[PDB]
Amino acid sequence: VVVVVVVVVVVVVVVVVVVVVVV
Amino acid sequence: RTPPTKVSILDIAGVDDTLQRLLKEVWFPLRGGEACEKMGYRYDNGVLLHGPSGCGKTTLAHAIAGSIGVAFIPVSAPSVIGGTSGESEKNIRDVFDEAIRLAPCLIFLDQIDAIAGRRESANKGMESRIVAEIMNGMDRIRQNTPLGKNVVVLAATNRPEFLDPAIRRRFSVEIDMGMPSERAREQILRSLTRDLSLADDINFKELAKMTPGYVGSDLQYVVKAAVSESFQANIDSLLAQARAKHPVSQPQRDWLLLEAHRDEEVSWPSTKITMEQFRKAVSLVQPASSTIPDTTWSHVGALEDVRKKLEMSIIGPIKNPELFTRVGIKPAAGILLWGPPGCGKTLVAKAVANESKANFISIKGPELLNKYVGESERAVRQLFSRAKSSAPCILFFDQMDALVPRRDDSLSDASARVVNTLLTELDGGIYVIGATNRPDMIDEAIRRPGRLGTSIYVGLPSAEDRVKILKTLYRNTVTTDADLEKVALDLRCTGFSGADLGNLMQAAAQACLERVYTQRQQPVITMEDWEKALNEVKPS
Amino acid sequence: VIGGTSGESEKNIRDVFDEAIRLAPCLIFLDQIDAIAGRRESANKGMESRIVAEIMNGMDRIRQNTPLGKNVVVLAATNRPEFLDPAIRRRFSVEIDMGMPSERAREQILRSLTRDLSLADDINFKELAKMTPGYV
Amino acid sequence: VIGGTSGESEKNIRDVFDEAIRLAPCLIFLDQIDAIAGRRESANKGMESRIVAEIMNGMDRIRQNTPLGKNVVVLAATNRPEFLDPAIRRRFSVEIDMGMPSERAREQILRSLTRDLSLADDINFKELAKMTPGYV
Amino acid sequence: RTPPTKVSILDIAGVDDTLQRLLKEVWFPLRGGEACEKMGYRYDNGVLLHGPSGCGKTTLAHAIAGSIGVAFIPVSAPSVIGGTSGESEKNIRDVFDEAIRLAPCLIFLDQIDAIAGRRESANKGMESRIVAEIMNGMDRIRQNTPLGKNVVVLAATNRPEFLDPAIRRRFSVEIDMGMPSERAREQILRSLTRDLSLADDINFKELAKMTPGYVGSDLQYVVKAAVSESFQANIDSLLAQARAKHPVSQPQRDWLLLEAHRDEEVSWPSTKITMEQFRKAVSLVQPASKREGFSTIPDTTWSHVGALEDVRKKLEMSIIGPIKNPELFTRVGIKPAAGILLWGPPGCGKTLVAKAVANESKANFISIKGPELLNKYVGESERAVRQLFSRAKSSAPCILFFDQMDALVPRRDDSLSDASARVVNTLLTELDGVGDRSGIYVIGATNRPDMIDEAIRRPGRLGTSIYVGLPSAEDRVKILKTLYRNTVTTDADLEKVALDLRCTGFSGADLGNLMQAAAQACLERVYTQRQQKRKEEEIEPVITMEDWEKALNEVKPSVKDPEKYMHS
Ligand SMILES: Nc1ncnc2c1ncn2[C@@H]1O[C@H](COP(=O)(O)OP(=O)(O)OP(=O)(O)O)[C@@H](O)[C@H]1O
Ligand SMILES: Nc1ncnc2c1ncn2[C@@H]1O[C@H](COP(=O)(O)OP(=O)(O)OP(=O)(O)O)[C@@H](O)[C@H]1O
Ligand SMILES: Nc1ncnc2c1ncn2[C@@H]1O[C@H](COP(=O)(O)OP(=O)(O)OP(=O)(O)O)[C@@H](O)[C@H]1O
Ligand SMILES: Nc1ncnc2c1ncn2[C@@H]1O[C@H](COP(=O)(O)OP(=O)(O)O)[C@@H](O)[C@H]1O
Ligand SMILES: [Mg+2]
Ligand SMILES: [Mg+2]
Ligand SMILES: [Mg+2]
Secondary structure, rough: OOOEEEEEOOOOOOOOOOOOOOO | OOOOOOOOHHHOOOOOOHHHHHHHHHHHHHOOOHHHHHOOOOOOOOEEEEEEOOHHHHHHHHHHHHHHOOOOEEEEEEHOOOOOOOHHHHHHHHHHHHHHOOOOEEEEEOHHHHOOOOOOOOOHHHHHHHHHHHHHHHHHHHHHHOOOOOOOEEEEEEHHEOHHHHHHOOOOOEEOOOOOOOHHHHHHHHHHHOOOEEEOOHHHHHHHHHOOOHHHHHHHHHHHHHHHHHHHHHHHHHHHHHHHHHHOHHHHHHHHHHHHHHHOOOHHHHOOOOOHHHHHHHOOOOOOOOOOOOOOOOOOOHHHHHHHHOOOOOOOHHOOHHHHHHHOOOOOEEEEEEEEOOHHHHHHHHHHHHOOOOOOEEEEOOOOOOOOOOOOHHHHHHHHHHHHHHHOOOEEEEOHHHEEEOOOOOOOOOOOHHHHHHHHHHOOOEEEEEEOHHHHEEOOOOOOOOEEEEEOOOOOOOHHHHHHHHHHHHHHHOOHHHHHHHHOOOOOOOHHHHEEEHHHHHHHHHHHHHHHHHOOOOOOOHHHHHHHHHOOOOOO | OOOOHHHHHHHHHHHHHHHHHOOOOOOEEOOOOOOOOOOOOOOOOHHHHHHHHHHHHHHHHHHHOOOOOOOOEEEEEEOOOHHHOOHHHHOOOOOOOOOOOOHHHHHHHHHHHOOOOOOOOOOOOOHHOOOOOOOE | OOEEEEEEEEEEHHHHHHHHOOOOOOEEEEEEEOOOOEEEOOOOOOHHHHHHHHHHHHHHHHHOOOOOOEEEEEEOOOOHHHHHHHHHHOOOOOOOOOOOOOOOHHHHHHHHHHHOOOOOOOOOHHHHHHOOOOOO | OOOOOOOOHOOOOOOOHHHHHHHHHHHHHHHOHHHHHHOOOOOOEEEEEOOOOOOHHHHHHHHHHHHHHOOOEEHHHHHHOOOHHHHHHHHHHHHHHHHOOOOOOEEEEEHHHHHOOOOOOOOOHHHHHHHHHHHHHHHHHHOOOOOOEEEEEEEEEHHHHHHHHHHHHOOOOOEEOOOHHHHHHHHHHHHHOOOOOOOOOOHHHHHOOOOOOOOOOHHHHHHHHHHHHHHHHHHHHHHHHHHHHOOOOOHHHHHHHHHHHOOOOOOOOOOOOOOOHHHHHHHHOEEEEEEEOOOOOOOOOOOOOOOOHHHHHHHHHHHHHHHHHHHHHHHHOOOOOOOEEOOOOOOOHHHHHHHHHHHOEEEEEHHHHHHHOOOOEEOOOHHHHHHHHHHHOOOOOOOEEEEOOOHEEEOOOOOOOHHHHHHHHHHHHHHHHHHOOOOOOEEEEOHHHHHOOHHHHOOOOOOOOEOOOOOOOHHHHHHHHHHHHHHHOOOHHHHHHHOOHHHOOOOHHHHHHHHHHHHHHHHHHHHHHHHOOOOOOOOOOOOOHHHHHHHHHHOOOOOOHHHHOOOO
16 A cells, blocks of 8 residues: 555635725 | 436426516426527526525425426535535536536525625635535536537525625626515415415415515415414314314323224314414414504504504505505605604504514614714615615604704714714615604705605693593403593693503503502502502603 | 545545434434534644545435435534534524532432442532532 | 556546547647636646646647648637646647527528427518527 | 663652642553552553653653653654654554553653654645554554553643644643742752862752753753863963973964864873853853744943933832842742733833843843734734743743834734734734733834834733823933043033933933044044144044033934823
8 A cells, every 4th residue: 555645735825905995 | 317307397396586586597408409409509597586584495496396397406505515525526427427418407405605605705725615516517507508409407405695606707697586465475374375275365465565575485384373363263173073072181091092992083173274363373483583563553552643644654655655656656765753752653653664564673762873883884875774674664764863864064973973874774575664753863865755755843742631641541450430531630730741540550550560569468450559550650 | 534535534524424313213412513523714634624524414315315204313512513514503493501510419420420339428518519619 | 647646647648649649630628728728827736837847848849840741730628728838829820710500601501500400481580590599 | 571670760840849740640541550450440641741852851761761661662753764654653553462461561652753843734645544553553552451451651742733623632630830930940959060070169959940941851961061161271281281292373282182082092080060150151052942932131231221210210129120139029929920011212221221220120022123023824923922931931030022013012003914903803812911920021122102002001911001291401411421432521511412402302312423423523533633733543532521511502302292192
């Protein structure tokens, strides 16, 4: 039995946003 | 992947329009493929079902599959994805190949949106590759299938807008399973209660009227709740039989009694479900979605003049939609109630909502104003977004003068942007009610006909009206009636509104608690409790 | 539930919902279902995402493949109700909240626990119940 | 193309271009190339970058290993040409934009679609073309 | 199968609390199981050893095994894997069966987390089956036993959080060895220095006081470092012989000289370690706790801080004091832990005194530069804050300095996003977990206290506020003298410069700018001075009083509104 290298899923990240103000 | 002959067409109802399209778009290119074969034209149709969750999307695709009789391959989108990145495409490539190998065949991609999402925001390589694999597998169906037999792909999703436009284009037929109407919900209720023994008082039309915003799944719980209530009488009888056989708490003994017999079986009498249990079942079941107010006209004292205006413009055109529509009376979008605060504007709007059996949403003033450019207008639009989905629904805007001021030159660009949003939405079964105590500050474009063009004035009671309200309030909480006349005719209630009389009753109730507390240191609401309640309640 | 193959785990589950249906009426106890049926938003593991699908499909076969009066009821117990998939907890209308035992109930538990032990004669299984109003 | 192990995915691409060179003249059709040729800049990963670098290496061998007598043409189609990596997008000498058909094109499309069918002489394709404004 | 009768209890010290629990939880249900048999009580206790790495977990589990005397089956997680997917379970099934067959027995699963990680992320099929086989093997212990000859499985790991919850639930008994205290470290040092030759001045109690945050492994390096210092004299003599034999930098020659002979080995005289070498050894040894995340000690002393006597007294009585005399202060109800929020106008010395406190307390120092802990991944931003206090407790006493803290705990308004709020909440809970007798001294500095959350300033949190403001006219004299003294006019001229009305609003930074302006004015004068006296490099630049005269004119205070920073 030989263990092969297997690729997997990726992590999730965070994203900053900018919000306008009518005042 | 054999078709399950388990769920039948009789078990799926309220889809008469939907079942008509599925006959010439799913049934024909799966069983009568020979006609297409003589013409020599493959019929590849990807049917897409979408709507609110619980509308009977999964059940319909299984009832159709069991009736057509052709091979059926149920596919669930989350189970396609495997541990390895390449294995996810392996599962899909083993489906579209199998359908081609076993043509004619029916493919059901349940919860398609779980994998066919927008590959734009799905920046991950695997996410963007499942969509590509799905679209290529559909082209191979159009290419590699024989002229004799067709393969139909059925997709179900509650968010059709999340689908990749490269994918939603491949589903030409789109059926939007909206929510059933009163006529449609009656058909569903009859379909569910088809193998059961029923009484004669069951009015399925009445059940449909008082279940707004329910879906097929919610109505199944209502039936399930009523069935359990129907067996309550069959359990007490079952307990009595066990008790009569045997001369630790009571529930533990009941389990022990039923453990004794086991193989010994006694007959359960066949009783039937009444209508009162169905009314009880609806109350016990809270729909996933607001709720009809508990206020009736018995909670509303006097205001007969206001009631007649309200019973002729809103309440009437709900109970008999055909009687009013026979004489050309369109259901006005709403009523603009106005008068001093605290006089029963919100109370009567809740009474209208309850005698109309429709959903009720209340806004207590400037709750929608936001410091941002878009979220303030989106709150108003979201208000009508749920109101349509739960039609019939009554929207009550309390103190609406802060949300739609007059569009004068001195208005800036924040309240004008809200008036315009509200004007368009009122143009778009929704009964909007507005309340304001300064009608000179509300926009004149709102009070036009078709918009809230009907104004009903709800004002302060004089003297006889407060007697009815005080009697009404005291009656619904349990002093007699002779003392209530003295309290309401007292000169200290000269300016009392409806809320002040309600505040007066709470003050008297608190005075009762003070009397009980001193009684137990050394209960009936007495006149002396009202005496100190008159002093500590102000008209405000 | 866990098998020697990723696909074999569903085979074991598919051998449960089929056996209960084949031997209906039957009782299925999914003790701590949420331990292998958690939310799969961040669970990209292939096995995790297939148990939820297998669980929900197995309940429909119960409604279909039974002689009407030979129902099969699946009873699930879990100390973490929050890990259940909202797609599954909606399908479980009846929820029984066991809660914490009372003073009378805790005396029975203490006697039951100290059943295989050698005990003295001064042990009054009443003082222990009094001073454990928050014990499970 | 995508495989499970590390070098399996990249070796499938190398086999495709080597097969085309061995079969020259040949026509490679990379359907939905944006699925595997996405921008490794923003899409940061290990396999994704090696897939892109294998196509760039592959698309250079075909124009240098062919024996000047037979040519290999690579055809690729994508709805999102902007998602392709610029190193791969620049490797296509010709970009052809096939926009939505016009009125003249829609009439021709209907005739080709309505070619193996039986039609009545009353059908006016000009009316059909003019009543389908935003149809592809 | 046999105990490792080569390490004894005497060789492991400072674990008195741990050895007390291990007596009634491991030794008893392995040698006195007959009493349990008479009692009639199965022992399902899975004993788990956890704590900081290097606390002596592996050595203790082997010293206990050799002392109990019952059959011992050492298990190493990497050695379990043999080369086949099914063979891994064969090795585990050969352990729990052998222990049952040879009951009573002790199983030591060293580095259990290497084969008992979280199963949620265990994508590989083989990895997820070893955990199942291990957990099932513990149930077989409860079943296939006479309830008398119990078998106890002992697992040791430095990462208790990595264990599969399916396994950690089966380990009811968890022993947290933790890090040794001052009393315990003295015992370890005496135990470690038992086969060595020592002097008479060695105060092991004094050595334990000045080694906070050290573990048993770290204290072994201190002894090992001191041994090398004892051999330093024996190397110089060896070097001198090589120099006398042979008529490139000096250290390179030493390697070359010793590389030459390589065979002419000379006797090393048997000297003993003194107390001065132990003090040298402690400095050279960096404890495993201080390896990562700890800032270098600042070079600022109290001689660099001018005036600020009120701030100095508060800092020398709340941080510096309790660190030096933890017993003197605890007698008067002064707990050895504080949270201080320095605030004031910019340029007045908030960071200066915090760097002086970190240097004058001789304690461990961790500095966070504003929003340095924020990370773009989910959870990793909050784990950094929790890990920040996970090392501050382990290295107590420790000083946490949050500089410009208004960026790490902003006011929780509507415009905050669900990423920094999750960090503010995490930071609030960790400050609550800082015990009164924990030893963590948190210092915060910010020049805009009106933008920092008010929830951080409650008691238990940074409830101590010290205001660092603009100096007075007499205060600037101490600061100007301090600045000029640390860079080399005398001191009488400095009073005239600092008392000048042109420095009315000068902060500490402004006074430093004033000195720099005078220094630049000196060089400009020197450049013209050396052009008139020359047309040889012997020009002498000296800061004169006239340089201060033109420096006062061209320097203005950096603070615009002094009263803008007195509002909170
Ligand atoms: N038109 C209908 N006729 C009969 N029963 C219905 C109808 N609509 C729904 N039901 C019942 O309600 C349930 C609907 O199941 P189904 O899984 O199809 O819901 P859905 O609309 O697909 O929503 P979801 O996507 O959340 O599953 C079933 O128990 C079905 O019996
Ligand atoms: N209290 C102590 N007394 C004497 N020596 C100690 C003590 N604690 C640790 N040591 C020494 O430090 C080393 C400890 O090795 P061990 O593997 O037990 O560390 P650990 O605490 O188990 O950490 P890890 O599990 O990360 O290896 C040994 O060389 C041992 O002699
Ligand atoms: N009492 C003082 N004696 C001598 N120099 C001082 C004194 N106070 C401040 N300084 C000088 O001013 C500098 C200010 O450094 P520091 O970072 O502490 O400023 P601050 O007061 O914290 O303002 P900021 O909010 O900008 O950080 C010191 O490094 C030192 O050069
Ligand atoms: N005709 C009435 N009969 C009984 N109660 C009334 C009547 N009118 C008003 N009330 C009481 O006054 C209170 C306030 O009602 P309403 O004026 O509709 O809301 P608001 O005071 O917020 O405008 C209610 O709680 C209700 O009990
Ligand atoms: Mg469904
Ligand atoms: Mg160790
Ligand atoms: Mg500073």
